[PDB]
Amino acid sequence: GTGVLTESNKKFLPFQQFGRDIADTTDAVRDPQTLEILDITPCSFGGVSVITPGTNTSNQVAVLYQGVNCTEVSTGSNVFQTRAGCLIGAEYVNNSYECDIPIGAGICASYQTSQSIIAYTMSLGAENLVAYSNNSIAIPTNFTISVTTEILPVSMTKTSVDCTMYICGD
Amino acid sequence: TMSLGAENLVAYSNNSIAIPTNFTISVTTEILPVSMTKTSVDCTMYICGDSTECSNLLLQYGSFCTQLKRALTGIAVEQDKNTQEVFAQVKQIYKTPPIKYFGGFNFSQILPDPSKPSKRSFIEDLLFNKVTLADAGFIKQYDLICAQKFNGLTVLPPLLTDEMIAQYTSALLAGTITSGWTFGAGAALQIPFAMQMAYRFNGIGVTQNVLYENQKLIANQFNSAIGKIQDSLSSTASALGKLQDVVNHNAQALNTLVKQLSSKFGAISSVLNDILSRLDKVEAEVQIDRLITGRLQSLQTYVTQQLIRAAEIRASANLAATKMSECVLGQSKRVDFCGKGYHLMSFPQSAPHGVVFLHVTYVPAQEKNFTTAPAICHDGKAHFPREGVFVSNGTHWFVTQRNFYEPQIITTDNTFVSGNCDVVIGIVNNTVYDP
Amino acid sequence: ALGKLQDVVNHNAQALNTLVKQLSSKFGAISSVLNDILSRLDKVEAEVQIDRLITGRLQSLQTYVTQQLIRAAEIRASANLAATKMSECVLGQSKRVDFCGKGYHLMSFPQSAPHGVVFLHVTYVPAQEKNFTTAPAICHDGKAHFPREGVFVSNGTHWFVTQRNFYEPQIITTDNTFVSGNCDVVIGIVNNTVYDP
Ligand SMILES: *[C@@H]1O[C@H](CO)[C@@H](O[C@@H]2O[C@H](CO)[C@@H](O)[C@H](O)[C@H]2NC(C)=O)[C@H](O)[C@H]1NC(C)=O
Ligand SMILES: *[C@@H]1O[C@H](CO)[C@@H](O[C@@H]2O[C@H](CO)[C@@H](O)[C@H](O)[C@H]2NC(C)=O)[C@H](O)[C@H]1NC(C)=O
Ligand SMILES: *[C@@H]1O[C@H](CO)[C@@H](O[C@@H]2O[C@H](CO)[C@@H](O)[C@H](O)[C@H]2NC(C)=O)[C@H](O)[C@H]1NC(C)=O
Ligand SMILES: *[C@@H]1O[C@H](CO)[C@@H](O[C@@H]2O[C@H](CO)[C@@H](O)[C@H](O)[C@H]2NC(C)=O)[C@H](O)[C@H]1NC(C)=O
Ligand SMILES: *[C@@H]1O[C@H](CO)[C@@H](O[C@@H]2O[C@H](CO)[C@@H](O)[C@H](O)[C@H]2NC(C)=O)[C@H](O)[C@H]1NC(C)=O
Ligand SMILES: *[C@@H]1O[C@H](CO)[C@@H](O[C@@H]2O[C@H](CO)[C@@H](O)[C@H](O)[C@H]2NC(C)=O)[C@H](O)[C@H]1NC(C)=O
Ligand SMILES: *[C@@H]1O[C@H](CO)[C@@H](O[C@@H]2O[C@H](CO)[C@@H](O)[C@H](O)[C@H]2NC(C)=O)[C@H](O)[C@H]1NC(C)=O
Ligand SMILES: *[C@@H]1O[C@H](CO)[C@@H](O)[C@H](O)[C@H]1NC(C)=O
Ligand SMILES: *[C@@H]1O[C@H](CO)[C@@H](O)[C@H](O)[C@H]1NC(C)=O
Ligand SMILES: *[C@@H]1O[C@H](CO)[C@@H](O)[C@H](O)[C@H]1NC(C)=O
Ligand SMILES: *[C@@H]1O[C@H](CO)[C@@H](O)[C@H](O)[C@H]1NC(C)=O
Ligand SMILES: *[C@@H]1O[C@H](CO)[C@@H](O)[C@H](O)[C@H]1NC(C)=O
Ligand SMILES: *[C@@H]1O[C@H](CO)[C@@H](O)[C@H](O)[C@H]1NC(C)=O
Ligand SMILES: *[C@@H]1O[C@H](CO)[C@@H](O)[C@H](O)[C@H]1NC(C)=O
Ligand SMILES: *[C@@H]1O[C@H](CO)[C@@H](O)[C@H](O)[C@H]1NC(C)=O
């Protein structure tokens, strides 16, 4: 196998020699020479996603190592820690704007100005408190006739497949 | 034999009408799933964990893994779209002024509490306590989940945090309370809550003087209903059944996918390393192919089940978005759509992977028999009610509303004439007063 | 502009292209070409490879049909929604909120598009609002007068009754209002004169 061997405190009985897991993978072993218990762990791995504005715009990209602390990480000096992982190549900004490239856990990324990729907390909207009281009513004095557009799919492509021709052509 | 219900025959006749004389303000609860767990699967790690020979043999089977990954990513994006559609229906983050005199109604249990770290409400916190999440997708530093992670199955965190969902529901609630349905059309227009409730009463066919002359009773009934909602959501643990069921189904699917790795599928062993160590390349290729095919079919079944369940969740989220648009951003004339009874309003609350609507409805309470008539003859003309129904308590005739007994003397302002008194079936004789 | 329709077309085209490209996979056979297997092997030896190719391509077709069935269910739901919007927004005026566009719905106009429909929803949106002082009712001669259709407003000195969606103040008369009981119950009642025509 391949993995990291660590000292273990598992309570192996004197007759046992190895331990299994849910998927029947050996998670602990007994050293044949020095009868100690070793825990076997997968070494280290994770997903790597690439945040990028279109290649029409810029070839500069940011990288997201998903679900890892910013210590187990090509690698710029712009590391940032999101609940979704470690974000390298994005300058975190205390401002908040509308989400442009959703990264996760409320963190979004955009390409903005000397332009660079920035990461920020997405903005839900501008705050607005209603001037409410028990003898005040706001009544409109004018109107606006708006024309909105709504697009709805209706049908799709009618496809036909020749099973014999596709599988066993002539 | 199961019972459909208690039999009940309606005392019907052609000159008898039952009209309610009192009402009840009910607050029902409706739970709707919105999103599910965003899962990601590493095809190579799941099928051929750290094995070059298995990976090389897996390259033969084409692009099954790429389309499994594409399907999972599509579902993952769809979940955030569902949440955004249900909750992000408000253009601005509204908020109420510090004064909390909403015409005697007590909204303190649904408005946010600043004391808590997350600015959730009391009922929202109860809802979050009633549902336990197997995994939120957050960072897991160095179980039934470690086995999943080591085999390539991970969970992605949702784009909108629970705090953002709480802020969205707070904006919706503040807009509803301080502006009625006006914030769903254009800019929010402030209006006293008593006047907003008077409009809501007018919207179901009851005159506003009923609300104004019974304001304290209605406020007390609403407060009692909210308190009963609190008690029910704090007592019965099995309250949010649907959301917990969604979480359980996703977790069970992942656990089944992991346990499928211990199947031999006809090979000598389920462990790739044992096959590699005990057999030559020619002999081990057959066993590795069997394991690859079995695990690929298991992944296919998991993705198919996920796609069908995601379609179901998308339908539920569309329904929740419609209920937010129609029940919360306005008053609904649709029957049994925003709760049982005549709909007055609704209040949204977030919950793990779902939304909860507190539907406030008006239910007639105490009905009485009366003798009715389609029309009335005064001077050879037939008088019909402009808005209401003719009733009689035994000796005198009045005209009342159709949903609340408020009899008034039959005058020419209440009624309109149409033709003579030789056509209407069931007409009666009475005097119509002239102001 | 028409993102959804183009997305549908792209998804179908991509599915067909994937189905075609699956024909170049060996699936464990010596070759992905049927003719090469037939020419280089005897019947007994070639049957195994042909079976492997047949099984792989059959599974690929199964995946394509399953994806198509799920996507067709999605498109059918969308088409049912479009039919409902045609019935309610175009063939009539809708009271449902945010169903035929944001705002108070006036009308809608349909337009065709490749594999889809486009609705131009005409809606009415209030524009310029002003503050006013309001009151649930009014006392004239010991009776409480409530608006028949509208809301009582005041510009600072005088009291009028207006519509709820458009400021059109009118003198409070007995035709605008109706009486209900006395003036000892309503909370927030005010004092004003009701004109008698
Ligand atoms: C209501 O709004 C409309 C436009 O939103 C106003 O019409 C404009 O009036 C100004 C001043 O006379 C003109 O310069 C514009 O050309 C008009 N626009 C249009 C489209 O007609 C209208 O005056 C407003 N009414 C009130 C009472 O404020
Ligand atoms: C309508 O029903 C409500 C309650 O359903 C009645 O209010 C109750 O009245 C009794 C008698 O005065 C009190 O003891 C209760 O405390 C009241 N309850 C509440 C919640 O206020 C009301 O009296 C009924 N009205 C009519 C006309 O029957
Ligand atoms: C609205 O209801 C809440 C509770 O349902 C009220 O808060 C209670 O107030 C009493 C007296 O002030 C306290 O003894 C309780 O401990 C409070 N409970 C909670 C949970 O806060 C609140 O006072 C009500 N609102 C109004 C305006 O009366
Ligand atoms: C039906 O309602 C009428 C209207 O109130 C009743 O007539 C009144 O009865 C009371 C008895 O307490 C008298 O004091 C009033 O003078 C009566 N008014 C008129 C205009 O007649 C009548 O008694 C009711 N009848 C029944 C059977 O309930
Ligand atoms: C309602 O009143 C009318 C008029 O008072 C009644 O019509 C009378 O009916 C009797 C008997 O059929 C005739 O003799 C009269 O000539 C009718 N008068 C008129 C003016 O047409 C009618 O019968 C009454 N209805 C009831 C149910 O009592
Ligand atoms: C509120 O509206 C009333 C009604 O128009 C105003 O009263 C009028 O004010 C104008 C001033 O230009 C006078 O010419 C009229 O004679 C007044 N009419 C009456 C019946 O009094 C009043 O001034 C307005 N007040 C405010 C604060 O806007
Ligand atoms: C509205 O008008 C009524 C009647 O003009 C006022 O009622 C009077 O109140 C005073 C002070 O409480 C009493 O001394 C009078 O006897 C009352 N008159 C009547 C006929 O009841 C009432 O106070 C006024 N309301 C406001 C807010 O000014
Ligand atoms: C095994 O051999 C090693 C060295 O060859 C020795 O140090 C150790 O004590 C031995 N242990 C046993 C159980 O024989
Ligand atoms: C380049 O692509 C971006 C998409 O991020 C778009 O906003 C921009 O307008 C494009 N520019 C050109 C010149 O096509
Ligand atoms: C990362 O590890 C450090 C210690 O090595 C710890 O203090 C920190 O909380 C960790 N952060 C995350 C997000 O795991
Ligand atoms: C954001 O603000 C905090 C304090 O409010 C500060 O410590 C931090 O350096 C700021 N970040 C940036 C990128 O300026
Ligand atoms: C409005 O409510 C406040 C309590 O917050 C009260 O003091 C005030 O008198 C009320 N105004 C009217 C006009 O009733
Ligand atoms: C009601 O209908 C019955 C027939 O079932 C009839 O005999 C009776 O006269 C009717 N009552 C009135 C008031 O018309
Ligand atoms: C009306 O009278 C009938 C007569 O049998 C009775 O059954 C019914 O309960 C009464 N309805 C009400 C509301 O009292
Ligand atoms: C009404 O008055 C309040 C007082 O603060 C103000 O904030 C609000 O903008 C006013 N509304 C309108 C429509 O002018």
Task: Return the closest-CA partner of residue B137 out of B257, B33, B39.
Answer: B39
Distance CA A109, CA A122 (A): 9
Answer whether B391's CB lies under 8 Å from B397's CB. Answer: yes
Answer whether C197's CB lies under 8 Å from B203's CB. Answer: no
Place of tokens 């629970």: B162
DSSP string, C31-72: -S-HHHHHHHS-HHHHHHHHHHHHHHHHHHHHHHHHHHHHHH
Q: How many other C-beta atoms lie within 10 A of the C-beta of residue B330? A: 23
CA geometry: angle A97, B36, B40, nearest 5 deg:
85
Residues 6+ apart with CB under 8 A from B330: B181, B184, C97
Q: Which residue of C has its CA nearest to B290?
A: C28
In this structure, what token pair is assigned to residue C113?
């598009």
In this structure, what token pair is assigned to residue B28?
């029902």
Answer whether C19's CB lies under 8 Å from C65's CB. Answer: no
Distance CA B323, CA B173 (A): 14
Residue type, A23: A
N- to C-terminal Cα distance for chain C? 58
Is the CB of B426 within 6 Å of ligand 13? yes
- Residues of chain B positioned with their CB less than 8 A from the CB of A143: none
Place of tokens 């994005």: A90
DSSP character at residue B89: -
Chain B CB within 8 Å of residue A145 CB? no
Nearest to C115 among A145, A154, A168 (CB): A154
Residues 6+ apart with CB under 8 A from A54: none
Partner-chain contact A129 B273, CB within 8 Å = no
Tell me which residue has its CA closest to atom 1 in ligand 13: B14
In this structure, what token pair is assigned to residue B46?
């799941």
Answer whether B316's CB lies under 8 Å from B30's CB. Answer: no
Distance CA B365, CA B42 (A): 60
Place of tokens 């590391």: A79
Partner-chain contact B190 A132, CB within 8 Å = yes
The structure was resolved to a resolution in Å of: 3.0
Residue type, B265: F
DSSP character at residue B157: P
Distance CA C17, CA C31 (A): 21
In this structure, what token pair is assigned to residue C118?
């486009």
Partner-chain contact A159 C81, CB within 8 Å = no
DSSP character at residue C88: I
Nearest to A130 among B154, B160, B190 (CB): B190
Task: Return the closest-CA partner of residue B383 out of B429, B418, B408.
Answer: B418
Q: Which of residues 61-80 of B touch A (CB under 8 A)?
A: 80
How many A from CA of A81 to the centre of ligand 10?
Answer: 9
Q: List the B389-392 sheet strands across, edge first.
A: B17-20, B367-373, B389-392, B397-400, B408-409
Distance CA B284, CA B53 (A): 10
Ligand 2 atom index nearest CA of B216: 21
CA dihedral B411, B413, B418, B422 (to 10 degrees): -10
Distance CA B196, CA B208 (A): 10
Answer whether B126's CB lies under 8 Å from B110's CB. Answer: no
Distance CA A100, CA A119 (A): 10
**A-B C-beta contacts closer than 8 Å:** 132
Chain A CB within 8 Å of residue C186 CB? no
Task: Return the closest-CA partner of residue B58 out of B293, B271, B281.
Answer: B293
Answer whether B107's CB lies under 8 Å from B227's CB. Answer: no
Residues 6+ apart with CB under 8 A from B260: B294, B295, B298
Mutate which of C130, C154, C158, C192 to test ligand 6's pocket (most atoms within 8 Å of Cβ)? C158
Buried b (16+ CB within 10 A) or exposed e, C111-124: eeeebbbbbebbbb
In this structure, what token pair is assigned to residue A16?
């046992």
Partner-chain contact B150 A138, CB within 8 Å = no
State the ligand closest to the CA atom of B397: 4
Task: State the structure-solving technique.
Answer: cryo-EM
- Residues of chain B positioned with their CB less than 8 A from the CB of C102: 184-185
Distance CA B281, CA B269 (A): 15
Residues 6+ apart with CB under 8 A from B334: B326, C96
Residues 6+ apart with CB under 8 A from A118: A90, A91, A92, A93, A109, A110, A111, A112
- Residues of chain B positioned with their CB less than 8 A from the CB of A125: 90-93, 171
DSSP character at residue A122: P
Distance CA B222, CA B102 (A): 12
Distance CA B326, CA B337 (A): 9
- Residues of chain B positioned with their CB less than 8 A from the CB of A122: 159, 164
In this structure, what token pair is assigned to residue B185?
């059309």
Task: Return the closest-CA partner of residue C170 out of C158, C180, C162, C179.
Answer: C162
* CB-based burial label for B86 (10 Å; 0-12, 13-18, 19+): buried
Residue type, A84: A
| Rg (alpha carbons) of chain B, rounded to whole number | 31
Residue type, B165: I
Q: How many other C-beta atoms lie within 10 A of the C-beta of residue B139? A: 18
Distance CA B401, CA B19 (A): 9
Neighbours of C (≥3 Cβ pairs closer than 8 A)?
A, B
Distance CA B432, CA B420 (A): 15
Distance CA C44, CA C51 (A): 11
DSSP string, A92-120: E-S-----SEEEETTEEEEEE---EEEEE
| Rg (alpha carbons) of chain A, rounded to whole number | 29
Residues in contact with ligand 6 (CB, 6 Å cut-off) = C 155-158
DSSP character at residue B61: G
Q: Beta A116-121 vs B376-377: how paired, if at all?
A: unpaired
The partner residues of B246 in beta bridges, in order of sequence, read none
Distance CA C157, CA A15 (A): 98
Answer whether A24's CB lies under 8 Å from B262's CB. Answer: yes
Reported as half-sphere exposure (CB side, CA atoms, 13 A), residue C27 has a value of 24
To the nearest 10 degrees (0 to 180), the angle between helices B162-179 and B64-87 is 30
Residue type, B174: A
CA dihedral C88, C94, C95, C101 (to 10 degrees): 110
* SS3 assignment, position B230: helix
Residues 6+ apart with CB under 8 A from B294: B260, B263, B265, B266
Answer whether C51's CB lies under 8 Å from A156's CB. Answer: no
Chain C nearest-CA distance from A116, in A, is 27
Q: Beta B342-351 vs A4-7: how paired, if at all?
A: unpaired
Place of tokens 């070059």: B52
**Helices first, then strands: H and E counts in chain A:** 1, 15
In this structure, what token pair is assigned to residue C54?
């047949």
* CB-based burial label for C133 (10 Å; 0-12, 13-18, 19+): middle
Distance CA B116, CA B18 (A): 50
